[PDB]
Symmetry: C2
Subunit: 268 residues, 2 copies
Amino acid sequence: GHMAPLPLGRFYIHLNSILNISISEVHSPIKIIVNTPTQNMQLPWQAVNGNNRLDHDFAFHVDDNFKVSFMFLDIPIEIKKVSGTATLNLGNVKDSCFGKAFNVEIPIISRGFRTLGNLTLTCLYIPELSVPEQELPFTLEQATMDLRHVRSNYLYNEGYLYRLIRRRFVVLRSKQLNFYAEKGGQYLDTFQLSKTVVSIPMVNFSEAVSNLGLVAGILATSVDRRHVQLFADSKKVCQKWLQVMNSRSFALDRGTEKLWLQEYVNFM
Amino acid sequence: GHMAPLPLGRFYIHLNSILNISISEVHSPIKIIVNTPTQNMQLPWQAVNGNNRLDHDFAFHVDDNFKVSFMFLDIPIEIKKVSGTATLNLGNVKDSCFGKAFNVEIPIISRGFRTLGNLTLTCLYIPELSVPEQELPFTLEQATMDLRHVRSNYLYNEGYLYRLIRRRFVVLRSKQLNFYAEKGGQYLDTFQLSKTVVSIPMVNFSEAVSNLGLVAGILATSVDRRHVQLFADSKKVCQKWLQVMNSRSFALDRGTEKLWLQEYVNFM
């Protein structure tokens, strides 16, 4: 759908655990310092016994340059108090958590830098929707509970097609296509279609492909900003693949009655 | 100084205590839910014994419509778990915490509404300054530690002056002026000058004040958006009061060498 020149949206974080760290039975309230651009918070974390379980949720109005920082202060090891920071960059996990929950592990680099332990959290990105604030989920658990009303439409298509070298039996499932040797000989490559930019037919044929007998072409772009050019010797074929490869990726369940989910689907 | 059409700045909160509430020795991790516009966070608060001491700091990039909300969930009373919310409006405390720390008490209204207890916190507002983010304080304690390098300039002036009824011995100290009966007879009223809008001389005299022999006038505005009109029978007098009542309110200490403090002073 429509995005701001610098894409805005919602970022849900749920801190889970601090792994590979032996926390002492004896306690002294640990400061958890969370740093976002333009904002800051300082939290006392009391860990009964040596429990390494974090139960901290966060919802951030966010832009694409976002980079949350998690600093733990005076962690007692079984005294020796250690301090470290774990910074989570949105751009490095946006694709893997776009409209879906994604567990990620970020290291807690010691002060002055090696690595103390590993901070585990669950993230999930939701783009900006023209929907009231009181209609969005406040927690990650609430979002995923609603997001399971979003079915992925069955999408299957197969056939021969030229790309840049020779014609191969492309097989498309959902947004994923796989290059195949012969018809079903071998899988040659995957190219996961982008959930943003739309594939467009070609109008400027190459000098070489014109000699091969190729009439119409297809340009596709993935989630990794990498491109690929598809060519077919027939016209009707090109308006057949682009017709299915650019159809609606997702649909919504019946009776969901959620304003933001409807808008999230229309966005895609 | 210069402000955006909707004034932006920094808001520092430090939660202190939950008063008038008997918290149980027995524990079950309390969720602290903080709600700001566009953002949300869920914190586990573990209170050793029955300690009602909160040690939570917050720094918010803020606008004038800001309204932070603090919800406490499943508070155990000495079992009976109680839940409540305490919302702090920036507009109701902005004047009292502008460039200075200010302890305020906000009630924790029970779910469904009477009042459980009282949330005590310390706040402090800092306007938007053309200064790098890495040059601002991250915590309230850090701001007040720097803000004590900001001296209030000695300002004293006295004399007779007409206002709207008769002439009275106005006495100005800093930004505060006091109306006096006779010369030092009685204090009639205070009018704390605004730290934003500037007082301006008059050019359109009243039909009545022209007969009293009043030549030049003075218009002043307070921090409460309320106005007052000052009149003097002499011209030189009006350019004397407006010269001192609109002089620099604050100055900076020597050797402070702080970028944001310099800008905060130039802002005033």
